[PDB]
Coordinates of N, CA and C in Angstrom, one line a residue:
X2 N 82.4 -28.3 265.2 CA 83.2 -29.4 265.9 C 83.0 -30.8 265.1
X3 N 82.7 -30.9 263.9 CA 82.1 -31.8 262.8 C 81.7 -31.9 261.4
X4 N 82.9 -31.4 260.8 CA 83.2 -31.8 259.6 C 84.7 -32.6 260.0
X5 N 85.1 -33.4 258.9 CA 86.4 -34.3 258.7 C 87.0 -33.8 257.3
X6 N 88.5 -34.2 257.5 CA 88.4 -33.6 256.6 C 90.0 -34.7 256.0
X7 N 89.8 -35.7 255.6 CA 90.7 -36.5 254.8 C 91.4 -36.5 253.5
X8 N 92.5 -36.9 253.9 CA 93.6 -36.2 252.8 C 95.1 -38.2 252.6
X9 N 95.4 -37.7 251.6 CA 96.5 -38.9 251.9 C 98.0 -38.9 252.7
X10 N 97.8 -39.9 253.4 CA 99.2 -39.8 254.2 C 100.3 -39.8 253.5
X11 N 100.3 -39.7 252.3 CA 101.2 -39.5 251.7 C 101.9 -38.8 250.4
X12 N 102.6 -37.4 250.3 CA 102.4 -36.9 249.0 C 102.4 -37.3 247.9
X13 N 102.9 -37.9 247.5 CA 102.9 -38.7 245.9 C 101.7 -40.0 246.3
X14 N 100.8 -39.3 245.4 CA 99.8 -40.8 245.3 C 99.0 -41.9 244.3
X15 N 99.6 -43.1 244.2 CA 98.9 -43.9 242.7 C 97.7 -44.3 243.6
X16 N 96.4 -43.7 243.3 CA 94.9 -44.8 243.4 C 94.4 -43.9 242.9
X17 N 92.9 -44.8 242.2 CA 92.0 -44.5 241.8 C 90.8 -44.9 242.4
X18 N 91.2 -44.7 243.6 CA 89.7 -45.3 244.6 C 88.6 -44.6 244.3
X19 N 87.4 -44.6 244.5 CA 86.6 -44.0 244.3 C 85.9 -43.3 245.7
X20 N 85.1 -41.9 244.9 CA 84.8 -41.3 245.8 C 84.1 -42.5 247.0
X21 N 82.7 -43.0 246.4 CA 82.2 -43.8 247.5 C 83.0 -44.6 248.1
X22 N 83.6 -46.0 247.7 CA 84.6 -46.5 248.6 C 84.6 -45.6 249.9
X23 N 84.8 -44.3 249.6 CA 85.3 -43.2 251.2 C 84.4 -43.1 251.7
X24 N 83.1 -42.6 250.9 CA 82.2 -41.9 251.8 C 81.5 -43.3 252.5
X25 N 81.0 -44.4 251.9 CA 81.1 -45.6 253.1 C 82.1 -45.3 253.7
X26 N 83.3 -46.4 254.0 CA 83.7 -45.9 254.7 C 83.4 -44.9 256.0
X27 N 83.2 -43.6 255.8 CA 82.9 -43.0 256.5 C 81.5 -42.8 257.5
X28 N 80.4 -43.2 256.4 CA 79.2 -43.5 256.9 C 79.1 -44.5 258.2
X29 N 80.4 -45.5 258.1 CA 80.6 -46.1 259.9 C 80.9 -45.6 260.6
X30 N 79.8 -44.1 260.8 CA 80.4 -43.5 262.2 C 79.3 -42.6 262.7
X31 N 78.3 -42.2 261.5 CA 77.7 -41.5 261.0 C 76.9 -41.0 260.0
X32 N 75.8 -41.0 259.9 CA 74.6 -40.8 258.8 C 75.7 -39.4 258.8
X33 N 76.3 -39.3 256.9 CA 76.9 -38.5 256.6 C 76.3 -37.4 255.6
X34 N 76.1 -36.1 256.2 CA 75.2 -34.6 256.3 C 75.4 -34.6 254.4
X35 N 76.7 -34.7 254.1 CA 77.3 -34.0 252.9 C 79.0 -34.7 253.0
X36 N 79.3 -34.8 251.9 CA 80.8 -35.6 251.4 C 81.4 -34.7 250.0
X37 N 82.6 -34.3 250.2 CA 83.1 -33.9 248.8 C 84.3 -34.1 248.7
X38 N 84.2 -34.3 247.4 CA 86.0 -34.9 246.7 C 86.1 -34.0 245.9
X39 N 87.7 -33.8 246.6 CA 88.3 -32.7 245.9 C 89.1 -32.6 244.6
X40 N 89.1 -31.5 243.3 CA 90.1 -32.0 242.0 C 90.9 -30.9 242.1
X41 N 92.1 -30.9 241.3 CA 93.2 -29.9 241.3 C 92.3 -29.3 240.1
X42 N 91.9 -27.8 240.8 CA 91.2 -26.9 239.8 C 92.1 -26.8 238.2
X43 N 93.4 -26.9 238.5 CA 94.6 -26.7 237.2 C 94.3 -27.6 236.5
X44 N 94.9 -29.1 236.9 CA 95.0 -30.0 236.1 C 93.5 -31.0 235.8
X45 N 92.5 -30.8 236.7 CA 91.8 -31.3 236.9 C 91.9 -32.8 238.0
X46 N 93.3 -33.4 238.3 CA 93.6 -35.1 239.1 C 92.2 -34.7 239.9
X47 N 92.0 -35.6 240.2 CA 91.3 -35.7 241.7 C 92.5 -36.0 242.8
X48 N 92.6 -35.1 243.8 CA 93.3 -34.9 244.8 C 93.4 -35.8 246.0
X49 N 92.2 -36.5 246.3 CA 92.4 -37.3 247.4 C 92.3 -36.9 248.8
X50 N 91.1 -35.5 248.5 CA 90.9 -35.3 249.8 C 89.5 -34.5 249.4
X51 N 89.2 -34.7 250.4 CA 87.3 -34.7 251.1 C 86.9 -34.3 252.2
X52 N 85.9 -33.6 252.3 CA 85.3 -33.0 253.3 C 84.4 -33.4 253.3
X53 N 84.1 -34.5 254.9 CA 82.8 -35.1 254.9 C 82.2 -34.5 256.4
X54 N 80.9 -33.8 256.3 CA 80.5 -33.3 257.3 C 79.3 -34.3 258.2
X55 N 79.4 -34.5 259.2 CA 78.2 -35.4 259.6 C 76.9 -34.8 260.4
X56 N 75.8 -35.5 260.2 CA 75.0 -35.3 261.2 C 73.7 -34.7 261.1
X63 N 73.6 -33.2 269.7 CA 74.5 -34.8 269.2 C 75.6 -35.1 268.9
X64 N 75.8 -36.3 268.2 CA 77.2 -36.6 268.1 C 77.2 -36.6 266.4
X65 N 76.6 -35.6 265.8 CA 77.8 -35.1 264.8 C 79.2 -34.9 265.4
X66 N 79.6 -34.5 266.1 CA 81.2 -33.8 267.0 C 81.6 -35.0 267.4
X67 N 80.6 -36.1 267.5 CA 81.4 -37.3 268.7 C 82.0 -38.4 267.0
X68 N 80.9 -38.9 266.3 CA 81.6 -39.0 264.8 C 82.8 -38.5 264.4
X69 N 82.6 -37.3 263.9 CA 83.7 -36.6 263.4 C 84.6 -36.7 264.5
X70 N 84.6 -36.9 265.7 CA 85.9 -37.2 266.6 C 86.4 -38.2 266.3
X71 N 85.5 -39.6 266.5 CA 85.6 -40.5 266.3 C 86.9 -41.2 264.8
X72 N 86.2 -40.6 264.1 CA 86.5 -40.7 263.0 C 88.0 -39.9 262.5
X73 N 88.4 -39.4 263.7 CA 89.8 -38.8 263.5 C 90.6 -39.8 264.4
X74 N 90.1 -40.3 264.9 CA 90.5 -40.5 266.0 C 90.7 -42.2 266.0
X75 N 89.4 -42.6 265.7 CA 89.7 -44.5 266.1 C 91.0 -45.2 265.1
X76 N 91.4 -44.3 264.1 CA 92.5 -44.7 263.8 C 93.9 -45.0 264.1
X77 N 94.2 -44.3 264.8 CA 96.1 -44.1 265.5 C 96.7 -45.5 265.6
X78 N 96.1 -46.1 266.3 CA 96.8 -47.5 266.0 C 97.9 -47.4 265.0
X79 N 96.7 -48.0 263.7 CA 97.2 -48.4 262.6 C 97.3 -47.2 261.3
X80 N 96.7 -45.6 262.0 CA 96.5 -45.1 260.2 C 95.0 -45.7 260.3
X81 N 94.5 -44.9 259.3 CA 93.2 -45.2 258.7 C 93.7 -45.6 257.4
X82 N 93.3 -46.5 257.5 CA 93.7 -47.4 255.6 C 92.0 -48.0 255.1
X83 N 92.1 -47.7 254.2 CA 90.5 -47.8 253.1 C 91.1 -48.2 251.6
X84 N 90.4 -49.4 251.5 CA 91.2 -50.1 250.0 C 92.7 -50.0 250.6
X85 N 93.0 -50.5 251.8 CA 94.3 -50.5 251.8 C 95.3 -49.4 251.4
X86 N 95.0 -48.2 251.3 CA 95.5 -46.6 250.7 C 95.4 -46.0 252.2
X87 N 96.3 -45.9 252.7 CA 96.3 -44.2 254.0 C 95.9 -43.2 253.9
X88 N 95.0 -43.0 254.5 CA 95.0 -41.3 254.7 C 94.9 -41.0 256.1
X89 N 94.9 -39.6 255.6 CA 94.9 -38.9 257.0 C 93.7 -38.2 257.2
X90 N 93.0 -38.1 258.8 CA 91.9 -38.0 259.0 C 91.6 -36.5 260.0
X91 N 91.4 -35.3 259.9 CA 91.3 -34.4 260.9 C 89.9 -33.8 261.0
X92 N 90.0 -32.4 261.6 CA 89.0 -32.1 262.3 C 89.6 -30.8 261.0
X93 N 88.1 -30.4 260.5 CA 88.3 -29.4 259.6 C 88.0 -28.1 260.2
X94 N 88.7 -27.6 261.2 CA 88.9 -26.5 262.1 C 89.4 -25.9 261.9
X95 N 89.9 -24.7 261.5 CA 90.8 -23.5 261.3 C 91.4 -23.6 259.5
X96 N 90.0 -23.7 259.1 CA 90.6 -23.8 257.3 C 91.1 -24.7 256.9
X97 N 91.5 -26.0 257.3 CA 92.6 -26.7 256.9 C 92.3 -27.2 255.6
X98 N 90.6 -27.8 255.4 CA 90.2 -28.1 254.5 C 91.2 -27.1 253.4
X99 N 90.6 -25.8 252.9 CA 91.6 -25.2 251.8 C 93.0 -25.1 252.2
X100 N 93.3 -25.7 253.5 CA 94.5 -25.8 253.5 C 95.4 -27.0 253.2
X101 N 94.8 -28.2 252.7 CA 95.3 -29.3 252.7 C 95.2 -29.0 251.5
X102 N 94.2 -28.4 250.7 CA 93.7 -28.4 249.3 C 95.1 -28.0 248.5
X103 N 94.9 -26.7 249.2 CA 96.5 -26.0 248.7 C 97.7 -26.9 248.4
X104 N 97.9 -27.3 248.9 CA 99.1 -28.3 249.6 C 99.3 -29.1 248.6
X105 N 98.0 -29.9 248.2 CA 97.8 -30.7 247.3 C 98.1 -30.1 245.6
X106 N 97.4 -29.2 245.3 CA 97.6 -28.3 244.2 C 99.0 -28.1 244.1
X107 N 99.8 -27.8 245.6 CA 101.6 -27.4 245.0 C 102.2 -28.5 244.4
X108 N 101.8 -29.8 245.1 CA 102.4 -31.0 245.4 C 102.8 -31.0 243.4
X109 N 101.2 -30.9 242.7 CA 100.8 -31.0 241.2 C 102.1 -30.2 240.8
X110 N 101.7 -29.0 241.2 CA 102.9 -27.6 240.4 C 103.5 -28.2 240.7
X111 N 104.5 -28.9 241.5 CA 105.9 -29.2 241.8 C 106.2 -30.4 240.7
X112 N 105.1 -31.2 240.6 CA 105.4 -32.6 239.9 C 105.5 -31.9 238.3
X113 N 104.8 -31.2 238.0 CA 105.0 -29.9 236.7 C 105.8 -29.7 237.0
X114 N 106.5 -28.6 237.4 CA 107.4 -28.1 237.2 C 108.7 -29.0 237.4
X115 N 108.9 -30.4 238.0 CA 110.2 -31.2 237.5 C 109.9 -31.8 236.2
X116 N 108.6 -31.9 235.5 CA 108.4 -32.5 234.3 C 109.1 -31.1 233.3
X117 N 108.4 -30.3 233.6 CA 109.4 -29.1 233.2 C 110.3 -29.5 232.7
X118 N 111.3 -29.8 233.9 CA 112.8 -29.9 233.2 C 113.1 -31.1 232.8
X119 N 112.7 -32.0 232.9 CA 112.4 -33.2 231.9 C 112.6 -32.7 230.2
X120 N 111.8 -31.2 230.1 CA 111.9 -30.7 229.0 C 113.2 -30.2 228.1
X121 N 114.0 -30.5 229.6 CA 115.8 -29.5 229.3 C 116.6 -29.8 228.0

């Protein structure tokens, strides 16, 4: 009920934030267990998403932390992401996501090749 699991709100993304920037960030919520940034195993990018586990209220954190955002979005260095509860795989499932997003950007460079 407490890992998080952040990704960017948006698929195409220019930053070079760094990992820490996030994991502060994140540590306002909760003494954080373990933090990882993720790379596109292919090309190597760093992807822009992380699995930060906390920790009681490990579960109240990691709620928190999905959560105190809606307002506005969670923005860190002014960049959006998106913040969830890493429940039902999503982690390898945003991962995925992110890896196609690459193949896709490949494969229009591709035909850039034509």
């Amino acid at each position: 009920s407490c890992e998080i699991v952040v990704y960017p709100a948006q698929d195409s993304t220019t930053t070079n934030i760094q990992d820490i920037s996030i994991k502060n960030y994140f540590k306002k919520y909760g003494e954080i267990s373990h933090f990882e940034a993720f790379n596109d195993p292919n090309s190597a990018l760093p992807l822009h998403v992380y699995l930060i586990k906390y920790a009681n209220d490990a579960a109240k954190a990691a709620f928190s932390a999905v959560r105190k955002h809606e307002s506005s979005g969670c923005f860190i260095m002014g960049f959006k992401f998106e913040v969830i509860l890493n429940k039902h795989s999503i982690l390898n499932n945003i991962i995925s996501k992110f890896v196609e997003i690459n193949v896709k950007k490949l494969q229009k460079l591709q035909e850039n090749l034509k």
